[PDB]
Structure formats: C-alpha cells, structure tokens
Paper text:
pmcThe cystic fibrosis transmembrane conductance regulator (CFTR) is an anion channel expressed in the apical membrane of epithelial cells. It is composed of two transmembrane domains (TMDs) and two nucleotide-binding domains (NBDs) that are common to all ABC transporters, along with a cytosolic regulatory (R) domain specific to CFTR. Once phosphorylated, adenosine triphosphate (ATP) binding promotes NBD dimerization and pore opening, whereas ATP hydrolysis leads to pore closure.
The structure was determined to an overall resolution of 2.7 Å. CFTRinh-172 binds within the CFTR pore and interacts with both TMDs. The carboxy group on CFTRinh-172 forms a salt bridge with K95.
Numbering used by the authors: 1 to 109, 118 to 406, 437 to 636, 845 to 886, 902 to 1121, 1127 to 1173, 1203 to 1451
Write the structure that this text describes.
Amino acid sequence: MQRSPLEKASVVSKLFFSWTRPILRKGYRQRLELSDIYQIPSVDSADNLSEKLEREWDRELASKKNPKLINALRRCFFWRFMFYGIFLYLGEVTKAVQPLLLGRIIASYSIAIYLGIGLCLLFIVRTLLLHPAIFGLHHIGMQMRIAMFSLIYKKTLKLSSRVLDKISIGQLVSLLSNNLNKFDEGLALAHFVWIAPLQVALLMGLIWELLQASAFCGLGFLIVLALFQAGLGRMMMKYRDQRAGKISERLVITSEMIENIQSVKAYCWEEAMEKMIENLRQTELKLTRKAAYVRYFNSSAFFFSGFFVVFLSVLPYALIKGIILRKIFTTISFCIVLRMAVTRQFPWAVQTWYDSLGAINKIQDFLQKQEYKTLEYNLTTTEVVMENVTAFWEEGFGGTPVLKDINFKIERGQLLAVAGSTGAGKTSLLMVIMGELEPSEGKIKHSGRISFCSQFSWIMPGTIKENIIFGVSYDEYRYRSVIKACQLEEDISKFAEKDNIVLGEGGITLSGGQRARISLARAVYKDADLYLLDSPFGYLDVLTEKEIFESCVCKLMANKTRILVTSKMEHLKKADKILILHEGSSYFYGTFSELQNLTWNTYLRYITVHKSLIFVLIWCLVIFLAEVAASLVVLWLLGNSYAVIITSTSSYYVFYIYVGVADTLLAMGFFRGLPLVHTLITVSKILHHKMLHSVLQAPMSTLNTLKAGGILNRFSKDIAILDDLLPLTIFDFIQLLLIVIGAIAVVAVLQPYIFVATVPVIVAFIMLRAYFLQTSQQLKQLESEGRSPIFTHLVTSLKGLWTLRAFGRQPYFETLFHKALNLHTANWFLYLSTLRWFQMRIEMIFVIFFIAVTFISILTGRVGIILTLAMNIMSTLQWAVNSSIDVDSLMRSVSRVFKFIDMPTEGIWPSGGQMTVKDLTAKYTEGGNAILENISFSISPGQRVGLLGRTGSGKSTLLSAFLRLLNTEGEIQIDGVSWDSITLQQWRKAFGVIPQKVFIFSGTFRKNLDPYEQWSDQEIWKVADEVGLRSVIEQFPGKLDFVLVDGGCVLSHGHKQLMCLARSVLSKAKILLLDQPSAHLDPVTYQIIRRTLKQAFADCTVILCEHRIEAMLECQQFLVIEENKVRQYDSIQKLLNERSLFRQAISPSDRVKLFP
Ligand SMILES: Nc1ncnc2c1ncn2[C@@H]1O[C@H](COP(=O)(O)OP(=O)(O)OP(=O)(O)O)[C@@H](O)[C@H]1O
Ligand SMILES: Nc1ncnc2c1ncn2[C@@H]1O[C@H](COP(=O)(O)OP(=O)(O)OP(=O)(O)O)[C@@H](O)[C@H]1O
Ligand SMILES: CC(C)CCC[C@@H](C)[C@H]1CC[C@H]2[C@@H]3CC=C4C[C@@H](O)CC[C@]4(C)[C@H]3CC[C@]12C
Ligand SMILES: CC(C)CCC[C@@H](C)[C@H]1CC[C@H]2[C@@H]3CC=C4C[C@@H](O)CC[C@]4(C)[C@H]3CC[C@]12C
Ligand SMILES: O=C(O)c1ccc(/C=C2\SC(=S)N(c3cccc(C(F)(F)F)c3)C2=O)cc1
Ligand SMILES: [Mg+2]
Ligand SMILES: [Mg+2]
C-alpha cells in the first residue's frame, strides 16, 4: 500500500491532475492488482474526522438550548465551502461574457483579430477555474459523510434496550445507503442557489443592451416556468416519503428469509416468501412510477422553452418597430445561457439543499435518542444483593411485572442455582442483574466486573481463537487451560487449520453444541468478579455436560462468584444457594437442606429483457427520422414592418435562426418520454423477481459462501439505481444523442466545412472515452464491492449488542468499523480523481480545436455566424460525452444483478412410511472430507427410531442427507420409490421436519404458523391448545393478530420450541424428522412433547434425535453415530451395557426409569 502520490505532487501536477497518469497506464494494459491501490491521505482518516466532529457537536449540545448539527458542520467546513464557491462563480461569469464577444464579432462582419484572441483566452481561464474548484467541493462532501457515519455508529452501541426494539436493521441500512455516494457529489451543485440569480441579473443587463424592455416578456415566461418546476419538486418529495417505510420493511423480511434459507428449503416455503416480497414490491412500484412521471416533466423544461423564450423576447420589439434578423440571431446565444440557468441549475440546487437538510435532520433525530445507564461500587464486598426487586418489560405498564419482589444474596466464591419452568423469568432476572432491564422497585448492588454467556450463542467473523480472545492479549497458559476444560480439543483437532479456521458470522459451519461451547469458552477466558450463565449445557449430551460442569464450573472457577441457570438435580446438589421462581414470583429461596426438608453484452441483455422497450425505442427512432425529413423539406422550401428581410442582405440569416431552434425542434414530447420511463421501470420489476427466485433456488454449497452484508448490498443499492436513477439518466442521454445527430445532418448541407470539421472532434472524444473506461470500470467495480464489509460489520454488531456491552469491547468494535470505512474511502477517492482527469482532458481538446478553427476563420462575413454554430455543436457534444460516462457508471449495477441471476440451480406414495438406505455417503463440499461414510440400514413402517451420538458427530448431517440438502451419494428409498425417480419437490413434500434452528419471521402469529393460508382459525386454535400455546398467545393485545418483530423477541426459548412443534403438528406427513425438539425444556414441559408424540403421530414413522434420556424410553429402534459410522441397536439397555462412561453419567432418576 504505497503512500498517496498526491502527497509529494507539485503545484502544477496537482492543478492538472497529472499524478493519476500511472494508475491509468497500468489499468489500460493489465488487470489491476492489489499493489496498485494507494493509501488514503492522512486528512481523510475516519479516526481524526470523527474526533473533530465529535468535539464540535459535544460543544453544541451543552452550549445551546436548541442544538443543531448544522452549526457543528458549519464550524468544521464553512470557510473551505465558501473558498471554493468564489472560484466557481468566477468561472461561471466567463460563460456569460462569451456571447457578448461573439455578437461583437458578428456585428463587425483589424478589430476582429483582437476579438478572437480575447475570446480564445476566455476558454483557458474557464478550464483552470471550474475543474479544480469542483473537485475541492467533492472532497468536502466526502469528508462530511465519513464523519457523520462515524458518529452514527458510536451512538448505536449506546442505545437503550427499550428503544432498540423499535429501530430495525432495515431502517439502519437504508439510512446509510441513501447518502453513500449521493451526499458526496451533491456539494458541487449547492452554490448555484445564489450563483444563478446573479447570472440572471448580468444576462438581463446584457439583453437590455439589445432589446431594451422587451426582454422582460421572456423573463416573465421563465419566471412562470420556474414556479411550475417548484410545484413539480414539491409534488416529487411527497411520494418518496410514502415509499421509505415500505422499502425498510422489505429489506427486513428479505434479510431474515436469506438468513434462514435451510429452514425455508426444509419447509418448502419458497413460494410463500416470494409472494410476500411481490406484495410489498407492488406498493413500492406504484409510488416509484408516479415520481418518475413527475420527474420527466421536470427534466423536459429546458428543451421545450428554447423557441418560446426567443420568440417572446423579440415579439414586442418587432410589433412596435421593424427588427433586423441579425438581432434575432444574436438573441439566441444569450437565451441559451439564461434558460440553462433558470430551468436546470437553480432547481437542481434547490432540490440538493432540500435533500441534504432532510438527511442531516434525520441524523440529528437519531443522535438524540435514549441511552443505556447503570451503577456499581468499587468498594463493595464482591457480593451480589437483590432487595425486593420488581421489573416491568414494558415501560408504559410499569400491567403484570415479569419479576416481583425477587430477593437473593451471595458472598464471593459461592454458586447460586436458578431453577424454574418456561417463562418464569430466569433470562429476565439475568437481564435485570446486567442492567439491561431497569427495575420499577428495588435496588441491585454488586461490583461492575461481570462475564456473560447468553442462552442464544453469538459468533463473529474470524478464527475460533479470535472469538475466544475477543480483543485482549493472548495468554498461552490460560487459553490452553480453558480449551482443555471446555472439551474443545477433540472437535478442534478435526479442523484442517485447528482453531485458525475462519468462522462465518453466526457459526454457520458449526454444530449447536460446538457454538455453545465456544461461547462458554469465551466467557470462561475473560476474568471477572461475577459470572452469569444461561443454560450452557443445553445443546450438549450427558457425558459432555457432566465433564464440563465438573472441570469448568466446580474446578476451574472455584473462587469466583457465580450464577447458573439449571433444572438438573445433580447441579442443584452442589449449589450453595437455590432460587426457585414460578411466574415471576419467588417460590423458594434457600439451601438444598431446606428444599429436601420441604462489455456490450450487458447493454444487449438489458435492452432485450422486455419487448415493450424495443417497441418504444423503435417508435422514438421512427419519429426522429420523420422530424429530420420534415426539417429538410422545410429548409428546401425556404431555399426555393413586422420583420425586415432583404434579398440583398440578411436573407441568409433565416436558415441560421432555424438551426438555432433545433433544441426545441428535436425535443421528445410526452408521447415518447413517458412510455420510455414506464417501460424501463417495468424492466426493473422483472429483474428483481428473477434475482430473488434464483437466490432461493440455489444450492446450499453456493449459498454458504455469501456474506449478509453483500446480499444486503445487492438487494438495497443495486435495485434502487435501476428503479430510480437509471430510467432518467437514459432519457437524458437519448435526448442529447438525438439532438446532436439531427443537428449534424442539417448543418452539413448549409455549410459543408462545419461537417468536415465536427468529425475530427468526435473521433478524438471517442478515442479518449475508450481509453478512460478500461480503468474506470475496474475502479467502479472495486468501489461497488467496498460497501459489503461496512454492511456486514453493522449487521454483526447489531446482533451482538448485549454481549458487547456486557464485556466492554466498544472501543475494539469502533476501531474495526473505522478500518472498513477507510477501505471504502481509498477506492472512492481514486475513482473520483480519475473522473476529474478525464473531464479536464475533454475540455482541453475542445479548447485546442476551437482555437484552431477561430484563427483559421479569422485568417480566411459569415465567420461569426459559423463560429456561433460551431460552438453550439461542440458544447452539445461535450454534454453528451459526459452523459455517456454517467450511464456507463450506472450500468455496473445491472452487471452485478445479472451475475447474481446467473447462479446454478440446486437440482398415495407416502403410505407405510417404510425407508431403506444403501451405501450412503455425505459431504458438504466436493473434494472434501466425508462426514458420513458407508451408511446402510432399514426402518419398518410405523416405527420409532432414536438417533444418538456425542455433540458434533453428524446427527444433523444425517438428517440433512435424508432431505438431500448437501452432497449425497447412495440410494434412499421410501415405500419402494427411489429419490432419483421423482423430482426434489416431490421427495421433500413427504417429510415433516423440525429444525434445530428455530425460524421466526416478522409477521402475525397466524402467518408465522401458516404462511400459505390454508388452515382455518378454528383448527389453528385447536392445535395451539393441543401444544399449550393458548395462554401464551392470549397474553398479547392481538390474539393471532399480534405482529412479532425481531424474530420473536417477545417470546421465550421454550415458546419458540412449542411454535415449531405446532407447525409440525399442523403438517400431516407420514415420515417425521425431529431434531432435538426439547432443547432447553424442563421435565414438566417435556410432558407436552411426550403426549404429542404418542397422540398426534399415532400412525407415522418417527426418527427422533434427542440428548434427553427419558425420550429414549419412547423408541424401539436405535441408531448410534460413532467415528463416521452408524451402528444399529434394538434395546437401549443392550446399548448402555456396552458403554461404561455413558452409563455412569446417567442420572439416578434416568437409571431408575431404565432399570426398574
Ligand atoms: N423482550 C421482551 N419483551 C416483552 N416480554 C418479554 C420479552 N422477553 C421475554 N418476555 C416475556 O417475559 C416472560 C419471561 O420470559 P423469559 O425469557 O425470562 O423466560 P425464561 O424463564 O428464561 O424461559 P426459558 O426457560 O424458555 O428460557 C415470558 O412470558 C416472555 O414472553
Ligand atoms: N456447513 C458445514 N460445512 C462444513 N462442516 C460442517 C457444516 N455443518 C456442520 N459441519 C461439521 O459437521 C460435523 C457434524 O455436525 P452436526 O451438526 O451434524 O453435528 P451433531 O452431531 O448434530 O451435533 P449437535 O449435537 O451439536 O447438534 C461437525 O464437525 C461440524 O463442524
Ligand atoms: C459593451 C458594453 C456596452 C457593455 C459592458 C457591460 C459591463 C457592465 C460588464 C462587462 C464585463 C462585466 C464583468 C465581467 C466579470 C466580472 C467578475 C465577476 O466576479 C463580477 C462581475 C464582473 C465584474 C462583471 C460586471 C459587469 C461587466 C463589467
Ligand atoms: C449581479 C451582477 C454580476 C450583475 C449586475 C448587472 C449589471 C452587469 C447591469 C445592470 C444594468 C446594466 C446596464 C444597463 C444599461 C446600459 C446602457 C447600454 O448603452 C450599455 C450597457 C449598460 C451600461 C448596461 C450594462 C450592464 C449593467 C450595468
Ligand atoms: O456546461 C455544460 O454542461 C453545458 C455547456 C454548454 C451546453 C450547450 C448546449 S446544450 C444544447 S441543446 N445546445 C444547442 C442549442 C442550439 C442548437 C444546438 C444544435 F442544434 F446545434 F445541436 C445545440 C447547446 O449549445 C450545454 C451544457
Ligand atoms: Mg431463558
Ligand atoms: Mg445438530
């Protein structure tokens, strides 16, 4: 990463942007390598930028009664903003004085050589004044966006738990996405809000020089046009506000359904998901089309006022006194500049100010939210004391408190066991202790140092070692002792690079017990006064749980204050204190002694998506050609008081007025533009549908390589550019191309020498564009790819917020966010610099060619007229060449969308339910190690099978291999029907599967239980009562109509397990594949699963995986996974007698049941 060459660039080198020549050469010849990227300047660093803005905003907050972020932004960049605006205005005056000089030349036809030299000198100054100032404005905008992004992230980690619930990741990601690249380049257009009125005043004086008070009619026409455009912009801002919330909701749902894709595939819910997304897109697209209709009219004002302004300006003068055609010809040159200023530069600047002030107001609104607070003592005894503590989940109710008068006291070094049934408030008690839930009555008192292990494991991107260390120094002895105690040596040995294997966020490649043990190891590794643990042994088998409980809790952490949630009697035996809760009330508190007593291919693909687009383009081309023919015959007809036309002189001026009106003669009306934007917005709808379908049909081996931030990137930014930015960019490019072509045809016949000179310029522009785009496309692709790490870090940090706050690693996460910000900044800065170089060089070619043409014309009557015509043609060519670069920039998102669309595809009878398996081998990757090898067994119809094995052995791998969700190789048959014979949909429809990872999406209770809307509320209530969900469901304001958010955050773990059981009961399948249905349930609640298994699945084949022993009392066949091989048994007593350690680890109640 070589230091930026801009650092040691000379004054002339910085002025002409000539330090970008190396990167251009390298990109032109070869594909860019990593070593070709340069370090960001030391001014653009996120750390320093955010530190400055934080100082100014912190001063504003305390100082003022009405803090506003605009004052802090003013104090950081006001003088640089104005500095660049001064030179911008200076360069805009040159565009206004140039017509004056042209008119003096025309009227004069020795003075004309001096006039030509001065006109040629104006071009040079305009180039050295505008391009350096425009780039300085883009730099200010970039620095403002970085500092605002850093302040937002630092606020996110301080948000309160009560306000967290309402803020969604969709809203968070939409905020950043809107101003990601827009805010930076909006800075250049802002100064025109005051520059344009001054240009109007100067131009009005210069037009009074000729037409006296007659110019005020054209001025009034332009004023009415400006009021019309203001109304149009006001109307445009209305729809986008309506659309924002729908967009955020769509993003939330798409992200959740992509995260739980294996559950979606197992349930065969792809069609319901697609239907929901299409329902949201209909509503969004209705407002998108309305906004596009309005923006078309706003963008057609410049091209339709051309004839009207000139005609109105000269008409009163002509009606009072005879006018000469020379004056009429001279008025068009001023009118072009004035129209451009009134109908294009002023309204765009006003819209820029509106959007920027709105974005800054939204950011301030976010920055003034409610924050997290807590209290502790350094002089405490390292005891934990709770005194009559009552807690309310909802702040408004504090209704029914979740906890009521909880009392407990523990001195340093003793254990406190916390028992109770589902929904009793154990996790809530831990939350109150952590300070995330503020009590309504009572007070908690401990020392601040706390270590937490959540009931739902959290994982972050990086190696296993990085996860355990979590941001502190690496201690070899401590790390090895913790690894040994947590029983992770056996499992880490299997990995290729040991613990150095990189883990995807959320631990997608690990088993549930492995994720639980990694989280436990992280907590054990941290040194703290208190250790909060929530169901750490839930996903583990009995022998592993016993080993961890003895070696990690009762040996490794003997002299630590500890709290442990457990429902096991063996675990309650060793606890110094016991606290039994029930429905948020202290049923019991005391010892166990007291309890016992009790490329152009992209352009082609885009154009041919929809037939309507082809028809519309053909229609527009046909009408263009008809207009060109009409103009030609009209010119031929003219060839063969109110006005003063003489055959001797000024008869020639007529044709040149006609060419002067070409901008309005060739403009697209509402019969050619509205259909063209409508059809492009149809193309966008089609592409989004295709992309979603491909993603949902892709194989898992392909889906497990994607990053949540990358999929969010593609579904948030790319879709928006196609929906809004691309349609009107293409409209403007088409308009400019048409005008240029028609003008070239008509002007060649009048003066041939203009045509034989326009082509050299066109050739030079084409060659330069082709040279530039080779490198600019590679920089654009890099920039587009640079946003995924930012989105991914945002998603991960929002997922692990309670753990981050509990441990205290906020500085570490802020550092990593700044790293990703700098990564995006490097590529964005390089892309903007190369773009400025290209535009500066295009202007230099224009200046050179005009100098040559003007000097040759002066060396060799109609010279001034020909100069005017030439300048109009060349300026329109430059405008079109810049619009083409914009369009090419926007087509890279089309290419990315097509890349995601081109993903590979994944790939009566159910009666007895009999199943045969023969020589089955399963792996996750081609050329990878086989998790299972040489499987073979048989299952009789209507029989119960118990699947057993140590954590991380391949039970979920076998259940996935049944559904063919990974690489499979063998023969499985059901009722004598091979899985090869029938389609994958048919094969998967015969299984009722309960996944180990629960999938709750954002939507109503009955939608969560029934996405296809086939069952009736009576049957749904019957099933809900059948699985003990009536009480839970009827505790919310909407019974079956309450909307769950944040993946069922208002539900407990056991409640989610019961919802999955209810889904499986609603499905009526002959074969059932259950994957640990009782994960964190107490034996009382397990009676539900027992009754349901015996009654609901009365005549069905059942393959039950479960680490619980009582469940093994309800099975006849047994399949034990060991060393990648499954051994078959028919008696659990025979199975246990062969294994000593497992039988020794069986609890006394379990062995009382097994052996009576
Ligand atoms: N964020 C929340 N907002 C509102 N209510 C909640 C929230 N989280 C849990 N609850 C409710 O508070 C009660 C206590 O739930 P909690 O998670 O503390 O139960 P638990 O005893 O830990 O259960 P489990 O044994 O399933 O882990 C439940 O009725 C639950 O629906
Ligand atoms: N997507 C994956 N890619 C590669 N290896 C995987 C993937 N998922 C799981 N594994 C590996 O397969 C092995 C078995 O995992 P599996 O989830 O089948 O275990 P399990 O016996 O069901 O464990 P648990 O009792 O924790 O549910 C583990 O070593 C795990 O790391
Ligand atoms: C040909 C004769 C009759 C007309 C003369 C018109 C006069 C008023 C015009 C011609 C050139 C103009 C100046 C050109 C450049 C600038 C620099 C700018 O930063 C402020 C306006 C200012 C200072 C203009 C003021 C008006 C001006 C002096
Ligand atoms: C905002 C700034 C830049 C523009 C100020 C407007 C200036 C340039 C305008 C306002 C009044 C105008 C003058 C009005 C009348 C005449 C008489 C004419 O025989 C020569 C030009 C001359 C002298 C004009 C020159 C330009 C002028 C001075
Ligand atoms: O600074 C900028 O971006 C910038 C600068 C200059 C322009 C000039 C333009 S636009 C347009 S239309 N015409 C025009 C007018 C009458 C006739 C013709 C014909 F027929 F010859 F093509 C073309 C121009 O002269 C646009 C933008
Ligand atoms: Mg819990
Ligand atoms: Mg598993």
